[PDB]
């Protein structure tokens, strides 16, 4: 887990932090819909996965930014995992 | 105890400005958001802006003349609406609400009774 | 923005009597809609949160549905200390937005 368990690290905090950032620069573009804390982590949790649904994403620029931090760290947390969990 | 406590009155004289206080106790998290909403009297409830203490950051309604700024004192964990150039139509309660975060109004203050006269 | 239509403006109930209050937004927010309680002279009072959900303190009489565009905030057999205006508010978009409330009017 020097390597497994030490993505998860890193990533449980992207996730957290994003969400954060994530309300906090979506707020004030009218319209946005990113937020709120609670599904701001559920929109991460799609984001850092890849999977994104489209029921919710970033709409403002520093927004589409902590998006764009949460993919990469996300695409890479899930990456080093990937030949952990399964190696 | 009251989570919210707002004083009862403001007289302000036409195009002179004023302060309002909001001081919240209780649990507070970094979530928190307190927002602020004027009443006319006979009236329906207005959002007026919305502030982060543990970041600083305001946004405000847009479909009405800025009348407000909004600062936020962490150390006395009090919130502040400065009104500026008043008139009769700024004349309303001004209450202050704390939001978790989550889209609601968990708890309001009492409210500021505001009269713009001379 | 989103526009959040209560209508009728005023609502009169005989006592005991089951009564719902109607919030239409102008396109559809889930179910992230709440309603508030305002009696005279007094500070609005959360009621029911995220169209549904009951908030400990409020009495099992008042309720909420609906999802998408409309919702309805029911009170199952009103009493006078039901007698107050009633807001929705929506937290689906920025800015969060308040309908034009709702007065409730028993009749004795």
């Known amino acids: 887990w020097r390597a497994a368990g030490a993505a998860t690290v890193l990533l449980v905090i992207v996730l957290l932090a994003g969400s954060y950032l994530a309300v906090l620069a979506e707020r004030g573009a009218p319209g946005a819909q990113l937020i709120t804390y609670p599904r701001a982590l559920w929109w991460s949790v799609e984001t850092a996965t890849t999977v994104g649904y489209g029921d919710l994403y970033p709409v403002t620029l520093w927004g589409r930014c902590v998006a764009v931090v949460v993919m990469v760290a996300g695409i890479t947390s899930f990456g080093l995992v990937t030949a952990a969990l399964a190696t | 105890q009251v989570q919210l406590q707002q004083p009862g009155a403001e007289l302000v004289k036409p195009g002179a400005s004023v302060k309002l206080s909001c001081k919240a106790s209780?649990?507070?998290?970094?979530?928190?958001?307190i927002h602020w909403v004027k009443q006319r009297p006979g009236h329906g409830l207005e959002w007026i802006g919305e502030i982060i203490p543990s970041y600083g950051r305001a946004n405000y309604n847009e479909k009405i003349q800025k009348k407000a700024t909004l600062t936020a004192d962490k150390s006395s964990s009090t919130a502040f609406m400065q009104l500026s150039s008043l008139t009769s139509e700024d004349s309303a309660v001004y209450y202050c609400?704390?939001?978790?975060?989550?889209?609601?109004?968990?708890?309001w203050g009492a409210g500021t009774t505001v009269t713009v006269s001379s | 923005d989103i526009l959040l239509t209560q209508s009728p403006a005023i609502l009169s109930v005989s006592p005991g009597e089951r009564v719902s209050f109607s919030c239409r937004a102008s396109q559809s927010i889930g179910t992230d809609i709440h309603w508030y309680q305002q009696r005279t002279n007094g500070s609005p009072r959360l009621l029911i949160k995220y169209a549904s959900e009951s908030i400990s303190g409020i009495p099992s009489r008042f309720s909420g549905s609906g999802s998408g565009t409309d919702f309805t905030l029911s009170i199952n057999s009103v009493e006078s200390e039901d007698i107050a205006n009633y807001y929705c508010?929506?937290?689906?978009?920025?800015?969060?937005?308040f309908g034009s409330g709702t007065k409730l009017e028993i009749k004795r």
């Open positions: 609400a704390r939001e978790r975060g989550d889209g609601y109004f968990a708890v």
């Open positions: 508010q929506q937290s689906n978009r920025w800015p969060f937005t």
């Open positions: 209780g649990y507070t998290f970094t979530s928190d958001w």
